[PDB]
Structure formats: C-alpha cells, structure tokens
Amino acid sequence: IEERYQALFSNAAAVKALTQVVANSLGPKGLDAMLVDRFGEVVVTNDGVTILTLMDAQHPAARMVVNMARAQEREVGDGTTTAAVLAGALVSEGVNQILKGVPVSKVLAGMNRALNHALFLIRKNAIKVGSITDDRLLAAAKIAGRGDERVAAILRDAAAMLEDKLQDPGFKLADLVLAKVGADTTLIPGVVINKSPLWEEGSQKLQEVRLLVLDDGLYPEEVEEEALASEAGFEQYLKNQKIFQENLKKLKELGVKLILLTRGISDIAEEFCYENEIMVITRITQKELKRVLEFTGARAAKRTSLNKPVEELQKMLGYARTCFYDSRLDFTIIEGGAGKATATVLIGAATDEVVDEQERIAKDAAGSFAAAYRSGVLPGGGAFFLYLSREVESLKNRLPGMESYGVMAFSEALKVPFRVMAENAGFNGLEKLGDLMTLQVQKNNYALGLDFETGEFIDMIAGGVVDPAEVVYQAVKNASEVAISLLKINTII
Amino acid sequence: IEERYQALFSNAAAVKALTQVVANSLGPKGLDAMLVDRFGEVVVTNDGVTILTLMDAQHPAARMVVNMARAQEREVGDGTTTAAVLAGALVSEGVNQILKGVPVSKVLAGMNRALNHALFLIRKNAIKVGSITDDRLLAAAKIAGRGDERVAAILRDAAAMLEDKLQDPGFKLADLVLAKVGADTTLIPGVVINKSPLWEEGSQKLQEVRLLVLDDGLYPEEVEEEALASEAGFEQYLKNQKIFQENLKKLKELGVKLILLTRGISDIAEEFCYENEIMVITRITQKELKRVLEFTGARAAKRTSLNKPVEELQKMLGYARTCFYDSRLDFTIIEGGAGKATATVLIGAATDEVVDEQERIAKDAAGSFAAAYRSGVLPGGGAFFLYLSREVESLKNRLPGMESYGVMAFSEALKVPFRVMAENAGFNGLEKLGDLMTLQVQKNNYALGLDFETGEFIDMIAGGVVDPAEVVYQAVKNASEVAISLLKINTII
Amino acid sequence: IEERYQALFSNAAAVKALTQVVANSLGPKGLDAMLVDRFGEVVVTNDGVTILTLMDAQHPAARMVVNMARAQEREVGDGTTTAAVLAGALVSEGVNQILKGVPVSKVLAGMNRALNHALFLIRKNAIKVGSITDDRLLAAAKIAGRGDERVAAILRDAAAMLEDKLQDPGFKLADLVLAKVGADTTLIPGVVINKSPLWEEGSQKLQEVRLLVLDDGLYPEEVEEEALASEAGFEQYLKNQKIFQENLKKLKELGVKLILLTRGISDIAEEFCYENEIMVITRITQKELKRVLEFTGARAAKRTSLNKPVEELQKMLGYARTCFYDSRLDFTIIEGGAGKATATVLIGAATDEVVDEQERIAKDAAGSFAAAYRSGVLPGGGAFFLYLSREVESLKNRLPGMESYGVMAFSEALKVPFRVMAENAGFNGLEKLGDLMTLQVQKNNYALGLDFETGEFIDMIAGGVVDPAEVVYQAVKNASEVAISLLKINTII
Ligand SMILES: Nc1ncnc2c1ncn2[C@@H]1O[C@H](COP(=O)(O)OP(=O)(O)NP(=O)(O)O)[C@@H](O)[C@H]1O
Ligand SMILES: Nc1ncnc2c1ncn2[C@@H]1O[C@H](COP(=O)(O)OP(=O)(O)NP(=O)(O)O)[C@@H](O)[C@H]1O
Ligand SMILES: Nc1ncnc2c1ncn2[C@@H]1O[C@H](COP(=O)(O)OP(=O)(O)NP(=O)(O)O)[C@@H](O)[C@H]1O
Ligand SMILES: [Mg+2]
Ligand SMILES: [Mg+2]
Ligand SMILES: [Mg+2]
C-alpha cells in the first residue's frame, strides 16, 4: 500500500523506464528492438505499440501507458512512439513541478488549458489537401513508410481506386495490406485468396470466370441422424440427395468455372467439380469473403440457394476477367472483377521476421495516408511541437497563479520528442533544439525543421516531410490523457 | 533486458558461433558434420540449412540466421552455407565499423547501397543458357551435385523429358527425386509407387496395362449406420450392394489390369481382383496420385464413378506400356504412360544415413540445374564474389560521407566465402585471396578462380565450374537482408 | 582448457569489458567511478590504475592489463588510463587482423617495428625544458592536476626548493604530498609530523628549537628479566637507571626543547620533559624520521647515544627556527630547519572521500611535473598520437608482406585515445579525428589539437596543454608490451 510522494515516485520511475526503451526507436534514425517470449519466440521491430505491447510490463503505470499506445494505434495507426515519449515527458515534468511544492490541482489545470489550446492550434493550422494525387499525401505516406517510396506510391494508387471507402470513418485502409513470404511487394488490382484450391495441378490461369460464392459448404441438405430411423426421414435423405445432384447440374449449365466456399465440400460435389473443369477453394476467411463478394459482384449463397431455378441463380453469380493460382506462393488472385474496384497491397519479403516488420511498416504508411487524406498535414520533424511549445508557454500568465507551472510543464514536455530524435541522429539534442527555436521565431516560419542526415535546417513541408494532422492531434491528446490521469494518483494498492 | 553496445556484442557473438560451425562444410573440400536427436537418432551431412536446422539454436540471433537459411533453401534450394557465411561476415564487419564510431544508420545506408549495386551487377552479368542440353546446365548440376557426374547426366536427361514443366515457377525439379536403400542410382522413365501391391506372389511384370485410379477406396456406397434401422435404409444397403458387384463386372469387361487407390478395398472387391488377376495398390501418396494421373493420362475417380455406363468409364482409364513390381526393393514402377512423360530420379545407397545424404545432394543438384536453366550462370569458386567486392569498393568514393565505412564493410565481407573455401582446401586463404584479386584485375578476367584441387588459377567458366545466377542473387540478397536487420537492433528483451 | 580461436576471443572480450569501463574517465571531460568492497567500503575516482585495481577483475587477461597499469603507475605516475585504452585498442585491432587470416607472427612483427619506430619518434620529438620556472613545466603540472592551477604552482614552487633531489632517479616528487582532512591546501616550507605530542595543552608555537631525534625510545639501557636475579644484574639495573637520569640532565643542559622518537618514552623521562619545558612526539614514521633528519640537520640517535659527553652530544642536535602544534588538525609543523631545505605539499579537503581523490590528483600532478622536468614535453590532447599514427602507417610497406597488417593495427590503435576523449567531450569522435588529421598534415603542425570545451582546433603547446615525454614513452611502451604479450596467446588452462 505505497502512499504519499513515494507513490508519485514509484509511478514516475515506472514510466521513465518504459519510455527510455522505446525512445531509441523514435525517428528516421531510430533503431530496432528484439523481443523474446517467456518460452522462446522472437520479434524485431521499430514499431512503438509493438515493442510496448510485447514486453510484459509489470508496473501498473507502465501497463497504462502501454494501453495508451494501444489506443493511439486504434485511433490512427501511427504516432505511437511519439505519444509514448510525449506522455513520459509530461509526467516527469509534472512530477518536477509537484515536488517543488506546486499544488497538484494547479499543475493539472495548467496542463489542461495547455492541452486544449494545443489541440486548438493543431486543428487550426492543419493544411488540408484536395486531390489524392497531391504530393503531400504521398509524402505523408513516405514518411510513415519510413522512407519507402515504392510502398507510398502503391498505397496512393490503391486509395485512388477506392476513395469512396475512405469516406466511411470505419474503413481502415491498412486492411488492404496482405503479407506473403517469398512474394514481391506489389499492387494487385484485384483480391487475393491466400489458400490452395481443392485440386491443384500446378500454377493455373482462368479467363472469363463466372463464379459462385457460398457462405456455406457444398453439401446436400442434411437430415438429423436420429431421423434416419424413420422411412420418411430416410426418404427425405434420398430426395435431397437427388435434388442436390440436380443442383450441381445447374452449376454446370450456368457455366460456373470457379467456386469459393467458407466451409467444406461433399465428396460427390468434389467429384462433380473435378470432372467438369471447375476450380474450388474451400475455407475462405470472412474478410476474404466480403472482399471477393464486393469485387466480383457475386451474391453470397448457402446450399439451399442452389434450389432456385437456373434463371434466378444466374443472378447470384459473379464475374472476374482473370483468376490465377500461383503454385509457388500458394494463393489465388482474382482480377478484373465486375463489381466495385479494389486493390490488394501485397507485401513481400524473404523471411517471416522481415515480412512481418515490412507489413507493420506498410500498415503504418496506409493508416497515415488515410489519416492525411481525412485530416490534412503538418510540418514533421517534431517542429510543429516546438511551435506549440512557445504558443503554450504564451499562456503561462494569461491566468496568473500557480497554474503557470502546470502550463510550463506542458510546454517543456513538448520540447522532448524533437530532442530525442536529434539525439538519435547523433547530434547535440539540446543545442539543435534551442537553435531551431530561435530560428523558428526569427524567420517566423513555424514549419522550419531539421534534416537529420545532412544536419542542416530546412523547410519541412518543402522537404516533403509531413505528418498527418490527426496523428498529431491524437498523439498529443492521448499522451495528455494518460499523463494527467497518472498525476492525479496519490495512493497504490 | 540487455541494451546498447552489449546487445550488438551478444548478437554478433551468437552469430559467429553459428557460422564457424558450418564454415567447414563450404566448398568442394568442405567436411561433413554429425548430429544426434534428443532421444537417439543420427544424421551426417555437408548441407548447410540442414546442419543449421538440426542444431540446438537457442539464441534469437542464431535462430534468425537459421530462418534465413530456410528462406534461401525455399527460394532456390542451393547456396545455403554460402548465405550463412556471407551473412556472418557482413555482421562482424558491420560491428567493427560501428565500434570505431560509425553511426549505425550510416553503416546500414552504405550496406544497402552496396547490396543494391551487387544485385544489379549480379543480374547484369548472368550468362544465359539456350538449351536444356547446354554443357553449362550439366556443369551447374555437377558442381551443385558435389562432383557427381552420374547424377548430373541423369537430371539433364530427366529435365529433358519435361521442359514444359520447368516453365512453371512452382515446379520443383527436385520433386522428381526418390530415395531407396539397396537400390542403384538410375534414371527411371516413369513413376514409382513406393509400396507393394495388396497381393504379391513375387516380382511381377505387366504389359499393356489399362489402369483405373481412385481418390477413394473401393467400397459400395455407404449408408449411415443409424438409417439401417429403417427398412428403406436397409433395402438400399442391399440395392447398392448389388450395384457394386455389377460395377466390378464392368471393371472386368473393360480389361483393367491395375487399380490404384488412395484409400482401402472391400473384401468382396479384393476377392474379385484376386480371381481376375487384377493387381491393386492401396493407400498411395498424394504425390504419387498426381504423378500417376498425369503420366498415365488416367482421370481420377471415386466409387460413385463406377456407376457410369461402361462406355463412359472407359474414358477415365489410363494406360501404361509396362508396369513392374520389384519384390526386392518393394516398390512398383510404371513406365510408358499414355500421358505426359516424366521421370523418376532414383537415388540408391546401402544405409539409411547415406541414402539420406545422397538424396540431399541429389535435390541440391536438381535445384541448381533448374535454377541455372531459369536464371543463367556465373563464375563459381567464390570468384564472382571477389569481382563484386572489387566493384563495391568502387562506390566508397562515388558517394562521400560515412556511408563509405558501411560500403567498405560490405566490400570486405564478400571476400570471405572464397577465403574460407581456400582455407578449407588447405591453402593460405589470405594469400590466395590477394594473389587472385590482383590477377583478376591484371588479366581483366573477372572469372579467374582457384582450382581447389590443383592449386593453380583457372578460368572458372571455362573450367566448367559455374553457379546458378539466382542462387547467387538470392544468397547475397538474403544474407544482406538478415545482417542489416540484425545490425539495426539496439536492445533485447 | 579453452583453445584455438576461442582463446583469442575469450581474451579479447575480457579486455574490452575492462577498457570500456575506464574509458569514461579518460580526458578533461572524463567522469568518475564509484567502487564498493565485497563487504561495504567505498571509493570515488577518475584515476585509472585505481579503478582498474579496485574492481576485483577475475579474467586472467583483465588481471594482466591491471598489472600493466600498475606498472605504468610505478614508472611515471600518470598516463594510466591512456595506457589502458591504448592497450585495448592494440589488442582489438590485432585480433581483427588475425581473424581475417593474418599470421600471428606477422601481426606481432609489424606491431613491434611500429612500436620501436614510435618510441624513436617520441624520444626524438621531445621538446626539453631549461629552468624549472618554465611555463611548460607548470603547464604539464596543471594538465596532470586536472586543471588545478593552485596545486601546479605549489608543486613547481616546492620542486624549486629541491631540484637536486630530482637528479636522483629514485626520488618520487609525490612523496612530498601529505593529505589532511579539514586542512587547507598549501605549501609548507618545512616538514610535518602527523601526530599529537605526548603532552598537549592546546595549539602551541616554539621558537629557536634545538631538537634531538631518536630512532629508539627514551628508556634506560635494559637488563634482561632473568638477569635480575643476580645482584650484579640488579646492580646494573640501578647503575644504568642512574646514568639515565644523568643523561636527561644532559638534555636539559644542552637546551633541548623538542624530542622526536620512533618508539616510546619512559615514565621517568616523561616526567623530566614535562617539568623542564620539553615537547615530545613519539612513534614517528620512518619517512617522517628521514625528512626531519635531513631538514633539521640533526643526527639520528639511540638511547645509548645519550652517554656521550655533553660536548659531543651538541653535535647530534638539530635546529628549527619555529615549530608549531596545530590543535585543530592535530599535527606538528617544523619550519626553518638548519639542514637541507624541503617542502610539504599539504592537501586539504572537508571529507575523507574528497581529500583522497585530491591527494591522488596531487600525486598525479607531482609525478607529471617531475617527469616533465626530467624528460621534456609533448603536445597533449592525444595529437602526438595522431602524428605517430600517420608516421607508423608510413611504415606499412617499407617491409613488404603481411607485417603490413600488423603495422596498420598499431597505427589504427593509436587513433583511439583521442577519439575517446572527443566522444567524452560530447563531440563526434570519428569526425573530429579525421578532420584533425587532415588539418595536421595541411598546416604541417603536428602539435595541433582540439580544445575540448570550445570545440575549436588550437595549437596545443601554445594552449598550455602538454604531456610529459616519458609519460607517453611509457604509456605506449607498456600498452604495447601487454597487447603483444596477449596476442601470442593460443591456449588457456
Ligand atoms: N526524413 C525525416 N525527416 C524528419 N523527420 C522525420 C523523417 N522521417 C520521419 N520523421 C519524423 O519521425 C517521427 C515518426 O517516427 P516514428 O518512428 O514513426 O515514430 P512514431 O511514428 O511516432 N511511432 P510509430 O510510427 O508507430 O512507430 C515523426 O515525428 C516524423 O516527423
Ligand atoms: N570444383 C570446384 N571448384 C571450385 N569451386 C567449387 C567447386 N565445386 C564447388 N565449388 C564451390 O563451392 C560452393 C558450394 O559449396 P557448398 O558446400 O555446396 O555450399 P553451398 O552450396 O553454398 N550450401 P549447400 O549446397 O546448401 O550445402 C560454391 O561456391 C561453388 O562455386
Ligand atoms: N585541457 C585539456 N585539453 C586537452 N587535452 C587535455 C586537457 N587536459 C587533459 N588532457 C589530456 O587528457 C589526457 C590525460 O587524461 P587522464 O584522465 O589523466 O588520463 P591519464 O592521465 O592517461 N590516466 P590518469 O591521469 O592516471 O588517470 C592526456 O592525453 C592529456 O593530453
Ligand atoms: Mg511513424
Ligand atoms: Mg550447393
Ligand atoms: Mg593524467
């Protein structure tokens, strides 16, 4: 039952230890981390929420910041490490002010006012985009993709085929990513079924594919096992074994050349498909189901649906221009669908470790693209944080009293992300920080930032280094929620 | 939770320990290794990915390298030991550069640049093949086959019968290999069922074989057990017990003399076959099924398929010129199929251990054959790597900065496989290295290498010592990818 | 029984771990280290040989480098950390060359030639001093004193009172240092007895002190306890109790006002001294004895010496102008002695920890002063090492063959001390290293070094930053002896 100041200590320390760890991954010069499970498994990543999640972090405070990261990821998908470092800074500063005797009440008030002002400036200064072709969107994607231009171009190009889906606040663009070992990273103008067909004789290409999709399995209508002791029961078994074979005949009459199922397939049916040139894939994902349904313009059927007359069934079929089973990667690719258009961002690499990290990078980039398209952009490099820092310090006195301390803490904490990245890039973090602030004021350009390889100060938006607006809004908001939440803590059980 | 430089050590150390072990297997003068199971089993091999797999690899880094090896094996099937050694070299070199104070970031940048240049040069210089007969294909097969010209001739001859199949990026030539103790290494122009027939009276030869093959078992159409309490149910048990017998008569009328099944056989049928001299094999592999299907031109049937008219059944039969059951080796050989032609590369030896290793060698040779046919060849003996080192060191200058160090590390690392193979062959590795590099430049022949037997420098391509191109590309790509990914690691949990 | 390469590893690693630790203490921006004994004791220091000595370092290699440091300290007293870092560099480089396949023989040869050339250049380029007043001597003292100018001035000033003693290769100037808690650091133109007198009535000052010094105790000539059973024995006891009291009377007649003893004092004598105004100090060090003997011009006596006639005794007395017992610090100070002149460099601080570290600094400075006075000076900052580095790399080919590698290693290792200090000063170590080397060649001034606070390149000798020549000679020589000694190692038991 730790209490008093030795609660606030026990907390703050617990957070520092956490943030220190991911601090090394923040930025373009950030380094990776290697994690192993309690009993032998291994991941390597630069992703923040990943690192923070996989260490089983035992202190409650640490677990809370981890949850904050999770939240940040859920909201936008990037800016996790930023949120962590920022949170840590906020907390440490808050503690510092509190130890010097500043009332918690006041620290929290100042921090809140600061927060609201900050978010205000962030929403206000967001520079919005009109296109999807705008180089600022692709730039956002590149920065989030950690410098991969190929991937950024791929995602822009896919989003282009969508856009409408971006209008729904529930469409995660990264859902389009699909990772496959031994693949080559590329854009597929169709959907992928990541499974081998029921019968394979090597790689295979299909053209003018009329397909039938089932959220069922291709079995006859069943008769409960008990009921088979009852003549009529059995006669029903026979009857709908007959109507079943008739239905398969319907399938051939309609010219079906592909069948996808979410369940299994009868032996009789399997034979029918083999003899009549029909390809089958079983056990498809629900996700896969939805996407192929949309793309091919097919309607989802159950076994009973095959009892429709043939004229009514042709209406449930879908169409794809081509369809290709890759014997080397063991999946199937449907392209040229008669329904909505869509894409699959295929991410390839040699080994599991690498394709995993590349998928994470991909999804980061996708989310940040979408986030940019939805919310506009801002100058990256952490500069806009510095703008926010002086603007927040502006508020130091607009309410006089001890809330000032609180405000200062917030301002000072906003200085930290940048400093870290500069330190990560081998520079004198503090020096570059100060210099850049002075310069920002003197040329009045709050978009001036640091080029981390060359070491020269540049114009960030000019340099193609932009962050999505919502990523910053969300990062600051979440980091703030957790830090303020922790600072109000006085006792532990 | 080890961090900082003392992560980079524990990683690097863990890797050297691994690579050292397989280094002695690299080359034509490389030596073998012996491995034992947790509870009594034994392997002997010169193969890299195998040794690396069977080892107790506990460290995360080592496990990552094993995984890389696995990837290299998946991709091309040869060149694993090379990839391991190269990877290790890259890592140690990188560590050294980082220790003299080069920023990790810069090292990795330089290495990436080097990598890309290397791959470019590798692809550019690939020497293409235009025939399945080219003496360079057989050369590749010989070298990968560790000097065995018998096997190489067999694979050339076998690959020849296909050609149509190699065109599929999913066709593993090595899938043709089959190992049998007490056999003699030979080319079989058919497919083998590695099983004894259901009824054997000693070795037996069949000619003019009309055969029927089933992805089922030869049983009557079943009736669920419960339903038998229901008159109609039983009456149909009877009815399609009669229909089964008449179907067998159909088999006799068609003159079927061989039956292959992936499931079992009813006793009634087994008697039918005994009395009408029809040979039967049960429980065949999926491989065996697909192969015999393609080769005999038969169509796969299920029990229900025997209900067609006799005239219709005659269409799914297949035909083989001859068919021979070997009582000594206890398998069956189908030759002269009316379908596509194919081959079985039979690999024989006295003991389990040896035929296992000879099989590994065979598959390696097949894979390098196919890969040569697909991607061309390059000068082996480790020479082309020296050319690439000489070429990569070039960039040190063409881009200024500290990336140079990184590039140097890459350059210096490509030097290692050769030096290892030379030391393994009992030469002064460093001397031969220097001499050979100097010479390579002076005669401008980027293909001069060391004959590890004679000790004289020869032209490797003229000397018939060639590596498949894709094997080199994949090896460099993979070793690089893993080393770079490990060097970016800064912390371990 | 570790053997082969895994001896050379086990060694090299063991050394790295050691050197890393003291590397942080090297330089003007070096930081301190805290050590605790197996059972609760504590030291804080920047001294190298101290840090290295106090960790109980378990690996044989580590223990050897520690011994090397000890040696360096014995020889000159400064340059310990330099020697350690240099040794480490030499070893790591040597290992690197050896792993690439360079014959140990050759590495060692190259390193030796390099060593001899280096020492040659060091002896050749030593810039000698003529004075003792030369600002280059005081500069040497300041640099060694870690920037304390007060102390440097003190030591120069004392050495001035000696100089003759410096002519003997056996006089350690640092022997003049005396550390006292609660004292004030100052030069005393006399000698100090660090003990309280036999009888104290508070602080006390004596003038015109005629003193008697005894390497004995003031007791009568003894009679063995057995002998006291023998009349004549006892009569001898009486007799030389009588002649003893007479001798004390001689002591008063001669006007003795102070007596120093290395042993004890009789009760009768103690009374005699109390009643006749005579101060006594008992149990003085041998060191203290020698110094006060020299300074006061007294001759050492034993009890029997008091049997001389008075006229002959006056000849054994010594004289001091003044003599002062400080009741606050509890020691005694003799000044204005009629013998040789001498000094006591009194080092004061508040606490044990601090006065200890300050004594270490003092002795460092004293030794480096003396070393400068005896052997001349060189440009510090590690620059002269860089001169030596290019000069050593000069030798790379003057013998062609693989010794070249060895030579290079030596050269490259000489680059390391500087780099470390630059890294310690928060700079980019590698960058500053390279820049400075280029500049050194371009302005041809091999005395150009780095100002570690300002960050600008300056002329070192001009900047007052000089090392004693012998400190460098010794550092390089010793570091080399141990590194070469370790590299010849192939097996461990
Ligand atoms: N080339 C660049 N120049 C300057 N800043 C950059 C550059 N690339 C990325 N950044 C900045 O790096 C930060 C993002 O680093 P990153 O490693 O993604 O942390 P994070 O995105 O906050 N957490 P996460 O991406 O989920 O791992 C942002 O502040 C970017 O502005
Ligand atoms: N006769 C030869 N002369 C010179 N080099 C040869 C000769 N035979 C093979 N090599 C080289 O030896 C290497 C093959 O060694 P090997 O032991 O197969 O390693 P690996 O093939 O890379 N790994 P793995 O085959 O999976 O066990 C290649 O670099 C060949 O170029
Ligand atoms: N102001 C300075 N500017 C430049 N170099 C300096 C300065 N002060 C000291 N040095 C260098 O610092 C080194 C000595 O550092 P130091 O910490 O004494 O290590 P060390 O003397 O080799 N071992 P030790 O002195 O026994 O602890 C020498 O190379 C000096 O040239
Ligand atoms: Mg990011
Ligand atoms: Mg091979
Ligand atoms: Mg010193």
Numbering used by the authors:
A (entry chain B), B (entry chain A), C (entry chain B): 10 to 502
Provide the authors' original text about this structure:
Here we describe the prototype crystal structures of the bacterial Group III CPN from Carboxydothermus hydrogenoformans (Ch-CPN), an extremely thermophilic, carbon monoxide utilizing bacterium isolated from a hot spring in Eastern Russia. The subunits of Ch-CPN assume the modular structure consisting of an equatorial domain, an intermediate domain, and an apical domain. Like Group II CPNs, Ch-CPN is a hexadecamer consisting of a doublet of octameric rings, its subunits interact between the rings in a direct rather than staggered subunit to subunit fashion, and achieve cavity closure independent of co-chaperones. The closed state with a non-hydrolyzable ATP analog and the open state with ADP represent the conformational states of Ch-CPN before and after ATP hydrolysis, respectively.
